[PDB]
Scaffold this active site. Sequence first.
Site, PDB file in Angstrom:
ATOM      1  N   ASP B  95     -35.523  72.442  51.909  1.00  0.00           N
ATOM      2  CA  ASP B  95     -34.732  72.065  51.478  1.00  0.00           C
ATOM      3  C   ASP B  95     -34.229  70.290  51.550  1.00  0.00           C
ATOM      4  O   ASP B  95     -34.211  69.831  50.586  1.00  0.00           O
ATOM      5  CB  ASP B  95     -32.984  72.378  51.233  1.00  0.00           C
ATOM      6  CG  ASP B  95     -31.767  71.912  51.275  1.00  0.00           C
ATOM      7  OD1 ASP B  95     -31.271  72.233  50.657  1.00  0.00           O
ATOM      8  OD2 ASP B  95     -31.119  71.015  51.422  1.00  0.00           O
ATOM      9  N   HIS B  96     -34.485  70.393  52.503  1.00  0.00           N
ATOM     10  CA  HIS B  96     -34.648  68.984  52.938  1.00  0.00           C
ATOM     11  C   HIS B  96     -36.356  67.932  52.824  1.00  0.00           C
ATOM     12  O   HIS B  96     -36.383  66.684  52.499  1.00  0.00           O
ATOM     13  CB  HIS B  96     -34.603  68.568  54.636  1.00  0.00           C
ATOM     14  CG  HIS B  96     -33.427  68.755  55.063  1.00  0.00           C
ATOM     15  ND1 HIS B  96     -33.073  68.992  56.200  1.00  0.00           N
ATOM     16  CD2 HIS B  96     -32.533  69.686  54.557  1.00  0.00           C
ATOM     17  CE1 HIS B  96     -31.960  69.751  56.161  1.00  0.00           C
ATOM     18  NE2 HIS B  96     -31.823  69.703  55.726  1.00  0.00           N
ATOM     19  N   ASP B  97     -36.944  68.876  52.307  1.00  0.00           N
ATOM     20  CA  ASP B  97     -38.253  68.089  51.308  1.00  0.00           C
ATOM     21  C   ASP B  97     -37.777  67.415  49.948  1.00  0.00           C
ATOM     22  O   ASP B  97     -38.438  67.146  49.163  1.00  0.00           O
ATOM     23  CB  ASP B  97     -39.093  68.888  51.408  1.00  0.00           C
ATOM     24  CG  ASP B  97     -40.270  68.697  50.730  1.00  0.00           C
ATOM     25  OD1 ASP B  97     -41.578  68.821  50.570  1.00  0.00           O
ATOM     26  OD2 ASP B  97     -40.798  67.194  50.838  1.00  0.00           O
TER      27      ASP B  97
HETATM   28  C1  HEM Z   1     -29.126  75.228  60.639  1.00  0.00           C
HETATM   29  C2  HEM Z   1     -28.506  75.330  60.196  1.00  0.00           C
HETATM   30  C3  HEM Z   1     -27.861  73.943  59.061  1.00  0.00           C
HETATM   31  C4  HEM Z   1     -26.699  73.361  59.298  1.00  0.00           C
HETATM   32  C5  HEM Z   1     -26.308  72.668  60.576  1.00  0.00           C
HETATM   33  C6  HEM Z   1     -26.822  72.929  57.595  1.00  0.00           C
HETATM   34  C7  HEM Z   1     -25.902  71.711  57.476  1.00  0.00           C
HETATM   35  C8  HEM Z   1     -25.095  71.327  56.300  1.00  0.00           C
HETATM   36  C9  HEM Z   1     -24.242  70.346  55.593  1.00  0.00           C
HETATM   37  C10 HEM Z   1     -23.334  69.940  56.304  1.00  0.00           C
HETATM   38  C11 HEM Z   1     -24.785  69.776  54.321  1.00  0.00           C
HETATM   39  C12 HEM Z   1     -23.750  69.348  53.846  1.00  0.00           C
HETATM   40  C13 HEM Z   1     -22.522  70.276  52.995  1.00  0.00           C
HETATM   41  C14 HEM Z   1     -21.416  68.775  52.463  1.00  0.00           C
HETATM   42  O1  HEM Z   1     -21.712  68.814  51.288  1.00  0.00           O
HETATM   43  O2  HEM Z   1     -20.014  68.685  52.956  1.00  0.00           O
HETATM   44  C15 HEM Z   1     -25.663  70.925  54.044  1.00  0.00           C
HETATM   45  C16 HEM Z   1     -26.285  70.638  52.511  1.00  0.00           C
HETATM   46  C17 HEM Z   1     -26.989  71.428  52.259  1.00  0.00           C
HETATM   47  N1  HEM Z   1     -27.473  72.729  52.710  1.00  0.00           N
HETATM   48 FE1  HEM Z   1     -27.363  73.210  54.617  1.00  0.00          FE
HETATM   49  N2  HEM Z   1     -27.026  73.789  56.778  1.00  0.00           N
HETATM   50  C18 HEM Z   1     -28.032  74.468  57.485  1.00  0.00           C
HETATM   51  C19 HEM Z   1     -28.900  75.461  57.097  1.00  0.00           C
HETATM   52  C20 HEM Z   1     -29.103  75.832  55.820  1.00  0.00           C
HETATM   53  C21 HEM Z   1     -30.327  76.264  54.878  1.00  0.00           C
HETATM   54  C22 HEM Z   1     -31.232  77.144  56.046  1.00  0.00           C
HETATM   55  C23 HEM Z   1     -30.516  76.316  53.665  1.00  0.00           C
HETATM   56  C24 HEM Z   1     -31.232  77.015  52.760  1.00  0.00           C
HETATM   57  C25 HEM Z   1     -31.148  78.267  52.468  1.00  0.00           C
HETATM   58  C26 HEM Z   1     -29.547  75.132  53.414  1.00  0.00           C
HETATM   59  C27 HEM Z   1     -30.013  74.577  52.175  1.00  0.00           C
HETATM   60  C28 HEM Z   1     -28.828  73.416  52.242  1.00  0.00           C
HETATM   61  C29 HEM Z   1     -29.264  72.579  50.860  1.00  0.00           C
HETATM   62  C30 HEM Z   1     -30.369  72.252  49.436  1.00  0.00           C
HETATM   63  C31 HEM Z   1     -28.209  71.129  50.613  1.00  0.00           C
HETATM   64  C32 HEM Z   1     -27.330  70.252  49.894  1.00  0.00           C
HETATM   65  C33 HEM Z   1     -28.350  68.450  50.631  1.00  0.00           C
HETATM   66  C34 HEM Z   1     -28.260  67.629  49.894  1.00  0.00           C
HETATM   67  O3  HEM Z   1     -27.360  66.483  50.283  1.00  0.00           O
HETATM   68  O4  HEM Z   1     -28.461  67.889  48.221  1.00  0.00           O
HETATM   69  N3  HEM Z   1     -28.703  74.845  54.536  1.00  0.00           N
HETATM   70  N4  HEM Z   1     -25.905  71.451  55.501  1.00  0.00           N
HETATM   71 CA    CA Z   2     -40.049  66.110  48.429  1.00  0.00          CA
END
Ligand code: HEM
Ligand code: CA
Lengths: 466, 107
Positions: B95-97
């Site tokens: 996701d972070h990629d």
């Molecule tokens: C390690 C466990 C995980 C977190 C700690 C975590 C936290 C977050 C937060 C705080 C956000 C922002 C939410 C907001 O808008 O307030 C967030 C966004 C996104 N996630 Fe989360 N996450 C954890 C775990 C996952 C896993 C395993 C993911 C994939 C299946 C996953 C996905 C995403 C995505 C795609 C976003 C949005 C990214 C963006 O900034 O556009 N997360 N995560």
């Molecule tokens: Ca990328």
Amino acid sequence: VNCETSCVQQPPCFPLKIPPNDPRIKNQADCIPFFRSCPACPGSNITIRNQINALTSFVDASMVYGSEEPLARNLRNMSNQLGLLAVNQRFQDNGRALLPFDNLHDDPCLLTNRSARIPCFLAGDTRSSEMPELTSMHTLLLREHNRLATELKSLNPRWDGERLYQEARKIVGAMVQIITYRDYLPLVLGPTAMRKYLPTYRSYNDSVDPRIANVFTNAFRYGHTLIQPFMFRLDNRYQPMEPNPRVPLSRVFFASWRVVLEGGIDPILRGLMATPAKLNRQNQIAVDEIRERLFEQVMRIGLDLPALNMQRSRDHGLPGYNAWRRFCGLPQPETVGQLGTVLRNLKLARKLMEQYGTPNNIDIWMGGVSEPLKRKGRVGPLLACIIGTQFRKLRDGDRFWWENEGVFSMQQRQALAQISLPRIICDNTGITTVSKNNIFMSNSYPRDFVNCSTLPALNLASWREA
Amino acid sequence: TCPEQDKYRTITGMCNNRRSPTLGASNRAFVRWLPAEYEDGFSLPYGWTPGVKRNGFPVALARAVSNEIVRFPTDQLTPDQERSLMFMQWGQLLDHDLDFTPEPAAR
Ligand code: HEM
Ligand SMILES: [Ca+2]
Ligand SMILES: *[C@@H]1O[C@H](CO[C@@H]2O[C@@H](C)[C@@H](O)[C@@H](O)[C@@H]2O)[C@@H](O[C@@H]2O[C@H](CO)[C@@H](O[C@@H]3O[C@H](CO[C@@H]4O[C@H](CO)[C@@H](O)[C@H](O)[C@@H]4O)[C@@H](O)[C@H](O[C@@H]4O[C@H](CO)[C@@H](O)[C@H](O)[C@@H]4O)[C@@H]3O)[C@H](O)[C@H]2NC(C)=O)[C@H](O)[C@H]1NC(C)=O
Ligand SMILES: *[C@@H]1O[C@H](CO)[C@@H](O)[C@H](O)[C@H]1NC(C)=O
Ligand SMILES: *[C@@H]1O[C@H](CO)[C@@H](O)[C@H](O)[C@H]1NC(C)=O
Ligand SMILES: [Cl-]
């Protein structure tokens, strides 16, 4: 403003209001902090508000190397002509490399342990330190680049710093693509949705839009249902490492000190391999460690991630459940009974109808994770559609896709196909026993584990420029 | 701009698509698969103005929906027998990629 300390609803703050009889937040005057995602066209009357992607949409390991040139140049080892990534100059994990520290103004990682004085790490993505499990994955990939750049120096002593960096970047980027599309995605979508949304790769199509969809940012948050309430760490014999084997998740957020001081990335990686993930169930969606105690140590109050997901979808102006069902070519339930049939759960359909009033109004994340999972997959029909459609666009719309003609030679692709995540762990850590393929399926010790000696490393013989 | 022949990826992601070199590149607007739905039509999110209904029904508080549907007792957790925690952790890393949606800082 601040949105972090105030409850007044003025731009750019959109704080989550507190309902009566809340299990945690008794004060109704209080609220959950929320910044609106800043628009691509600030303060415009003409354009419909849209959000920005700060990263490269492509699966190109941009979480390791960076998405901006000033940052990417700072992440490299600029001292020599070896083409390595910069490593931590103060601390090491039993002789092995760690991510360098970040120089931030308000560093959240220091707040987790005040006497430790361990700041956040510096990687391609800013969220690298969010949890030690993620940090361990970032560190592993950093070591892989350095290991590849070292072996490429032996094969080609003529190659300079720039050539060695780019070639190693090309391999790591290909590695992430292979593990994602061969090992990861089939286990997300299931066999049926995998064949529908990701059929056999042909070649690069320059007419395919490779951009990330706005809905995907909220839809791919399905993994928040897979999160366990604890961070699991095990010793080299895969037994609960003392004295903290089962640490609550509210106390691991931004806890970069736990990597540096409490062992390393080895116990964390052994935990992720030998611990089962959380199963997404209709009455067991997401744990209270992220629903009640998200960033509890580094914020004034603990956040509600699932609620933050639903608030963000409204902030992004994303349509409701039924609109996305129609988009995917899936039936759109009108009544509570019809929603019950779609969910195989009338009890859940009632609760959703109590909140939303109509299946048209259900937030995309909420309605997405509520759907019964596809056979041998971990998402429902709707999420499979959105996630599946996105990843094909990232594959077919990528000129530097590893299988594409001209990116790699025939023998290079044939050697790259032999790579695996367990093998990357073998080559870069002190772990000698890793998971059987598929790594994302193998979760029990010692039933699903084999020695590193039975697993062959990547053959870089085809990278020789004789 | 763009170079007629290249060997590696650019850091920004520019020039991956020759006909439209900004597609997939960093610091650009998201693509929309559906037209956006806002309170005022273009800017304000739903739940911004009190009393304003979405599609003929009152907007539910995100926290309230989390309380009634998402919430469950922790000790009741069902472990996935067919998935490892690495299945979760790779998801975040991946996701972070792909995407990071920026926010304004304080103030
Ligand atoms: C390690 C466990 C995980 C977190 C700690 C975590 C936290 C977050 C937060 C705080 C956000 C922002 C939410 C907001 O808008 O307030 C967030 C966004 C996104 N996630 Fe989360 N996450 C954890 C775990 C996952 C896993 C395993 C993911 C994939 C299946 C996953 C996905 C995403 C995505 C795609 C976003 C949005 C990214 C963006 O900034 O556009 N997360 N995560
Ligand atoms: Ca990328
Ligand atoms: C390279 O890829 C592109 C893009 O492919 C898409 O993404 C892929 C990853 C994959 O998901 C694939 O399924 C996608 O198509 C390909 O270009 C696409 O080709 C298709 C088929 O020719 C096009 O579909 C057509 O769209 C026409 C446009 O009309 C309308 O557009 C509206 C606005 O978006 C929309 O509301 C409508 O839904 C509709 O799309 C339309 O006139 C066509 O109608 C058909 O006519 C057929 C007979 O001529 C008939 O059989 C059928 O029933 C129907 O009536 C048709 O729907 C699509 O628009 C193209 N997309 C783009 C962006 O160019 C291309 O084929 C690939 N090339 C190679 C080499 O493989
Ligand atoms: C760069 O590499 C050299 C030699 O391998 C090493 O001594 C040094 O620590 C590295 N520099 C940084 C900042 O990572
Ligand atoms: C914080 O880290 C220090 C090591 O510097 C350790 O002694 C202490 O136990 C940690 N605090 C707690 C209780 O988590
Ligand atoms: Cl969208």
